[PDB]
Amino acid sequence: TIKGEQAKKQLIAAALAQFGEYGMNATTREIAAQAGQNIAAITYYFGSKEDLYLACAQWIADFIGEQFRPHAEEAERLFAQPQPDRAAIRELILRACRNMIKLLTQDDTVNLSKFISREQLSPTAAYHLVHEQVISPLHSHLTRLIAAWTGCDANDTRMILHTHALIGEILAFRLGKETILLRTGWTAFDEEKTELINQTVTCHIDLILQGLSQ
């Protein structure tokens, strides 16, 4: 039971790396070897390679959800006040963006990004599980905060597109990781360099918020 939860945790971590690189042409053999387990553990603990692929998506959704939950709760508390400040709405936008930038310049989330990025261009049931549980709630959370600050309608197609483009700036330092490392000459991100990325994206958000403001 507790022996099995450690085995399951190693299997998910190894599957995330192999699926992230190879999709469903990852092998149970290589997943099990990287996990320090026998190939039978995949069938025993998860049912099949296919079921382990979905458990990888579930793990990613749970991981993002635990990061996202406190931001949603803080926003609900702010909008419960009779007179929220526009400055406080902006601060929620920036705390969400800085938290995403931080996680997306961290080595140990790279396999999560690989797994999701593959599913963005070839979606399976895995993508829709993560989308419904957390990616859509996070996208809508940012769309509504931006609409709340600017005074626009969060459900307008244009607002959704505006927000999507902005999120692309946050994602560019992970999805364009090798491009920006070579172009800056940095061999790796560190705290000082993540702070520069924060300032860059914060600047663009402020400019776009001010331009959209009613």
Contact of 78 with 96, CB cutoff 8 Å: no
Measured from the CB atom, is 47 or 176 closer to Cl ion?
47
Q: Please give the Cα distance from 26 to 40 (Å, whole number).
A: 16
Kind plus residue range of the DSSP H or E element containing 41? helix 40-46
* Residue in 51, 66, 120, 195 binding its own copies, rule: CB under 8 A: 120
Three-state SS at 101: helix
178 near its own copies, rule: CB under 8 A:
yes
Which range in 15-23, 49-57, 59-67, 70-78 contacts its own copies by CB under 8 A? Answer: 15-23
Contact of 21 with 51, CB cutoff 8 Å: no
Q: Please give the Cα distance from 98 to 170 (Å, whole number).
A: 9
Straight-line distance from the first to the last Cα atom of the chain, in angstroms, rounded to the nearest whole number: 57
Three-state SS at 178: helix
The one-letter code for the residue type at 54 is: L
Which range in 35-43, 50-58, 62-70, 192-200 contacts its own copies by CB under 8 A? Answer: 192-200
Residues 132-171 that bind its own copies (CB under 8 A): 135-136, 139-140, 143, 157-158, 160-162, 164-171
Mask of contacts with Cl ion, 13-52, x by CB under 5 A?
--------------xx------------------------
Residue 8: which of 33, 39, 31, 41 has the closest Cα?
41
210 near its own copies, rule: CB under 8 A:
yes
Considering CB distances under 5 to 8 angstroms, the limit depending on partner class, which of Cl ion, its own copies, none binds residue 113?
its own copies
Q: How far is CA 62 from CA 8, 15, 105, 139, 186, in A?
A: 15, 16, 19, 16, 32
* Residue in 86, 117, 153, 195 binding its own copies, rule: CB under 8 A: 117
211 near its own copies, rule: CB under 8 A:
yes
- Phi first, then psi, for residue 123 (nearest 5°) are -70, 140
Measured from the CB atom, is 28 or 143 closer to Cl ion?
28
Considering CB distances under 5 to 8 angstroms, the limit depending on partner class, which of Cl ion, its own copies, none binds residue 28?
Cl ion
| Residues of this chain that bind its own copies (CB under 8 A) | 20-27, 110, 113-114, 117-123, 127, 131, 135-136, 139-140, 143, 157-158, 160-162, 164-180, 182-184, 196-197, 200-201, 203-204, 206-208, 210-211
